[PDB]
Amino acid sequence: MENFQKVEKIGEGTYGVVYKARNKLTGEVVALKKIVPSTAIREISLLKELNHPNIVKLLDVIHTENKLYLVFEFLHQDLKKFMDASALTGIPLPLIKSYLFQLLQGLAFCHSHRVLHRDLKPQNLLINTEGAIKLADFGLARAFVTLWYRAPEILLGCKYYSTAVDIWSLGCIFAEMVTRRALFPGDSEIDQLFRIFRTLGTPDEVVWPGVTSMPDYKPSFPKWARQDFSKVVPPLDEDGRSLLSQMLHYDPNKRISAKAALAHPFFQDVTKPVPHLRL
Ligand SMILES: CC(C)c1cc(-c2cc(N3C[C@H](O)[C@@H](O)C3)ccc2O)nc(N)n1
């Protein structure tokens, strides 16, 4: 640890405080993460091999007296700040398409390695000036406040959810980049659920087999009618609405996978434009 010097507080975290720091020896700039069980130790220790260009690289792990530290590669900005910095004009679709494309590449990689992020949000999606976007905090959930990106199966008490939960979160985020407003802004677990129901229609056995046998499912749930999808993410084109719709399928097994998503017609004319940041 005494191989670092804190440049400045960058942001609080789910499990700890995050710091920008310079490796007193290599002078390199890194993102320090201050977080114990050996399982967690092994668990996060495995992540180090989980390398991909769209996954924020985990440089090292430093466990000292209960004090666990995670060294990560540093990027200058998250997607929440980027979205706010552009709220008035909104992100140019080409960039939205490229970002969603790269994120699907990163999810495809983790998922194949039987890994899930479990908690995707604008805050754990970092960007650089080059036009690339990466996934941060992958694998941390299994090792150990917003519900806006939480998949419905999770909210329904299912304790054995699949990689599909990440896809749902990404779909939610995709909608958010297009509308400049969060798709399902819940302020409680049930409120989160009712907002999903209000937009996608209260699920039943027809669109989601086994849905009613689920843990927190209640027959007393109000019955909201599904809303024509074109009122949800306008003016996203039909290819986009098509892809988004499959990412938001109720039935986790039906919900489109990252790999399949990477071949949707929506990405046919995808590119890699550079955004404009002000560091
Ligand atoms: C826009 C602002 C939020 C930000 C975040 C980061 C930044 C953020 C993270 N995090 C910490 C969380 O656990 C994970 O969800 C993302 C990691 C490295 C960073 O450089 N770097 C810069 N320059 N600016």
Query: Which of 119, 187, 237, 239 does the annotation list as catalytic?
Result: 119
Residue 25's CB is within 10 A of a number of other CB atoms, namely: 8
Kindly state the greatest CA–CA separation across the chain: 62
32, 78, 279: residue to mutate for ligand 1 pocket, most atoms within 8 A of CB: 78
Query: CA-to-CA distance for 258 and 265, rounded, in angstroms?
Result: 14
- CA gyration radius for the chain? 19
Domain ranges of the chain: 1-76, 77-277
Q: Which residue has the tokens 């792990």?
A: 61
- CATH number, domain 1-76: 3.30.200.20
Query: CA-to-CA distance for 236 and 233, rounded, in angstroms?
Result: 6
Taking the centre of ligand 1 as the mean of its atom positions, its distance from the CA of residue 199, in whole angstroms, is: 31
Active site residue 191: no
Q: Which residue pairs, CB below 8 angstroms and at least 24 apart, start in 225-228?
A: 225/201, 226/199, 226/200, 226/201, 227/198, 227/199, 227/200, 227/201
Q: Which residue has the tokens 């890994």?
A: 115
Q: Which of these, 41, 69, 73, lies nearest to 54 by C-alpha position?
A: 73
Q: Which of these, 100, 279, 278, lies nearest to 176 by C-alpha position?
A: 100
Name the CATH superfamily for 77-277.
Transferase(Phosphotransferase) domain 1 (1.10.510.10)
33, 80, 82, 126: residue to mutate for ligand 1 pocket, most atoms within 8 A of CB: 126
- Count how many residues are written for the chain: 279
Q: Which of these, 75, 127, 86, lies nearest to 103 by C-alpha position?
A: 127
Q: Which of these, 262, 269, 263, lies nearest to 237 by C-alpha position?
A: 269
* Alpha-carbon distances of 63 from 15, 27, 34, 242, rounded to whole Å: 15, 21, 10, 46
User: Which residue is closest in CA terms to ligand 1's atom 24?
Assistant: 77
Q: φ and ψ at 190, to 5 degrees?
A: -75, -35
CA dihedral 119, 171, 268, 87 (to 10 degrees): -100
Query: CA-to-CA distance for 164 and 36, rounded, in angstroms?
Result: 30
Query: CA-to-CA distance for 25 and 45, rounded, in angstroms?
Result: 23
Q: Which of these, 176, 160, 273, lies nearest to 215 by C-alpha position?
A: 160
Query: CA-to-CA distance for 239 and 94, rounded, in angstroms?
Result: 13
118: left (phi over 0), alpha (psi -120 to 50) or beta: left
Experimental method: X-ray
Q: Are 19 and 8 in contact (CB under 8 A)?
A: yes
Taking the centre of ligand 1 as the mean of its atom positions, its distance from the CA of residue 22, in whole angstroms, is: 15
Are 1-76 and 77-277 in the same CATH fold?
no
Position 31, amino acid: A
Q: Which two tokens stand for residue 262?
A: 């990477």
* Distant-in-sequence, close-in-space partners of 38: CB < 8 Å, separation ≥ 6: none
DSSP for the chain, written as a single string = -TTEEEEEEEE--SSS-EEEEEETTT--EEEEEE---HHHHHHHHHHTT---TTB--EEEEEEETTEEEEEEE--SEEHHHHHHTTTTT---HHHHHHHHHHHHHHHHHHHHTT-------GGGEEE-TTS-EEE-STTHHHH----TT--HHHHTT-SS--THHHHHHHHHHHHHHHHSS-SS--SSHHHHHHHHHHHH----TTTSTTGGGSTT--TTS--PPPP-GGGTSTT--HHHHHHHHHHT-SSTTTSPPHHHHTTSGGGTT----------
Query: CA-to-CA distance for 24 and 6, rounded, in angstroms?
Result: 10
Taking the centre of ligand 1 as the mean of its atom positions, its distance from the CA of residue 6, in whole angstroms, is: 15
